[PDB]
Amino acid sequence: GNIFANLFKGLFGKKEMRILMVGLDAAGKTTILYKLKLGEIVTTIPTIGFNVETVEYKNISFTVWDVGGQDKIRPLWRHYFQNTQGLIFVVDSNDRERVNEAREELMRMLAEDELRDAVLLVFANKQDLPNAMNAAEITDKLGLHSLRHRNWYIQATCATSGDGLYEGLDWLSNQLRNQK
Amino acid sequence: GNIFANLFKGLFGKKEMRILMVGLDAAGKTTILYKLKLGEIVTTIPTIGFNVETVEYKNISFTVWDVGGQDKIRPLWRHYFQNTQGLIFVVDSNDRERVNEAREELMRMLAEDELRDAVLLVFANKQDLPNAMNAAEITDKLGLHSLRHRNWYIQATCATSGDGLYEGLDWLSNQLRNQK
Numbered sequence: 001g002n003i004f005a006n007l008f009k010g011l012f013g014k015k016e017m018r019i020l021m022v023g024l025d026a027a028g029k030t031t032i033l034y035k036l037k038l039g040e041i042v043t044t045i046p047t048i049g050f051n052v053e054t055v056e057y058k059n060i061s062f063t064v065w066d067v068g069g070q071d072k073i074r075p076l077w078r079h080y081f082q083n084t085q086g087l088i089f090v091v092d093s094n095d096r097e098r099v100n101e102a103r104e105e106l107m108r109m110l111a112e113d114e115l116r117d118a119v120l121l122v123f124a125n126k127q128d129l130p131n132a133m134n135a136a137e138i139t140d141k142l143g144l145h146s147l148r149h150r151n152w153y154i155q156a157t158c159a160t161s162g163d164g165l166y167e168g169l170d171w172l173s174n175q176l177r178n179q180k
Numbered sequence: 181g182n183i184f185a186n187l188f189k190g191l192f193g194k195k196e197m198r199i200l201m202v203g204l205d206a207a208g209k210t211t212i213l214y215k216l217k218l219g220e221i222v223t224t225i226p227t228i229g230f231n232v233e234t235v236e237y238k239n240i241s242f243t244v245w246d247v248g249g250q251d252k253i254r255p256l257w258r259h260y261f262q263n264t265q266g267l268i269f270v271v272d273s274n275d276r277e278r279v280n281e282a283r284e285e286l287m288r289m290l291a292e293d294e295l296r297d298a299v300l301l302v303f304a305n306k307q308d309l310p311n312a313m314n315a316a317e318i319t320d321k322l323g324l325h326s327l328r329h330r331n332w333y334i335q336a337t338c339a340t341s342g343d344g345l346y347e348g349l350d351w352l353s354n355q356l357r358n359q360k
């Protein structure tokens with residue numbers, strides 16, 4: 001997680017940004033945070049049934065929560081979407097079953113108005129698993145090629161080995177830097 | 181935090197103790213930990229698949245992980261078992277289908293020679309739901325009475341109102357101070 005500090009120690013212009021990482025639960029999001037080695041994973045429960053994990057590195061901060069079948073139900077999600085310039089959606093590639101439901105939660109967030117210019121990175125995760133759908137059918141199943149007017153990218157990962165996180169985050173780091 | 185800080189005040193100095201707090205998933209452990217207000221909830225993952233939440237209050241550390249995994253007492257658990265003085269088991273009182281499974285996981289834990297000297301506090305959590313089993317039924321379905329040569333106490337709680345937490349920890353904090 002030093003090669004990971006080298007991507008984000010350039011954005012470090014102190015305006016205070018947020019990268020969102022979300023997905024159905026058991027996708028691999030906490031594992032991916034832990035591998036980046038950018039700081040402590042610290043949990044808060046802003047309201048009941050809303051567990052938020054956050055690694056803060058410099059002015060930058062990753063923010064993770066599960067989606068799918070929305071808690072008690074509350075989105076102060078929107079006070080989170082504010083300063084969001086990157087959105088990562090982690091998907092369990094092995095899970096052909098709830099695959100169409102991640103589609104839904106993906107589409108619900110993109111339909112969100114404060115995430116109009118946020119860049120999208122999809123991690124098709126659990127690639128080491130034998131049934132794991134390849135990136136090509138994750139894209140198919142997520143309807144990603146129907147996204148006109150959004151800057152997006154799908155990256156095959158295995159968060160336990162760490163395979164794919166640099167490359168996906170390298171890209172993501174590009175777009176944020178390259179614009180504003 | 182404040183009130184809860186002062187219970188854990190005579191256990192201080194050099195001793196470097198651990199209170200384990202385990203139980204099935206969705207029992208209410210991160211919720212309880214967040215209520216304590218003793219420090220930030222830091223997650224680590226010391227090995228594949230094994231998330232562990234920790235709140236250090238000085239020399240007192242609260243360690244959390246879910247039990248019931250599919251099947252397993254890990255070599256790594258038993259290293260945690262070494263400086264565990266107290267052990268909190270948290271039961272979703274409304275979860276009637278998995279309480280027996282709650283029983284074996286706890287029966288499994290107490291069979292560990294590293295834990296033989298540990299004070300057991302069962303929080304019978306989620307006592308605000310209509311269908312919740314009360315402390316009397318729980319004591320039953322876990323069989324707290326068959327327990328010889330162990331110091332135990334069962335305390336009905338509501339993690340989200342924070343109700344019940346003080347008295348179970350009042351008691352536990354004494355068992356580690358005045359006895360022990």
Ligand SMILES: Nc1nc2c(ncn2[C@@H]2O[C@H](COP(=O)(O)OP(=O)(O)O)[C@@H](O)[C@H]2O)c(=O)[nH]1
Binds near residue numbers: 161229231
């Ligand atoms: N085979 C395989 N398992 C993974 C991978 N990433 C995460 N896992 C496992 O998936 C489970 C859920 O991970 P976790 O980070 O806690 O999930 P989340 O926060 O619910 O999405 C844990 O058992 C992880 O070890 C992966 O790429 N490959």
Ligand SMILES: Nc1nc2c(ncn2[C@@H]2O[C@H](COP(=O)(O)OP(=O)(O)O)[C@@H](O)[C@H]2O)c(=O)[nH]1
Binds near residue numbers: 308
């Ligand atoms: N109704 C009710 N639910 C609770 C209570 N305490 C915890 N929960 C909920 O049960 C779910 C799991 O809580 P959590 O702290 O994350 O679980 P654990 O860490 O997996 O043991 C969440 O929706 C919590 O809000 C309670 O006392 N009453």
Ligand SMILES: [Mg+2]
Binds near residue numbers: 029030053
């Ligand atoms: Mg998580």
Ligand SMILES: [Mg+2]
Binds near residue numbers: 209210
């Ligand atoms: Mg938890």
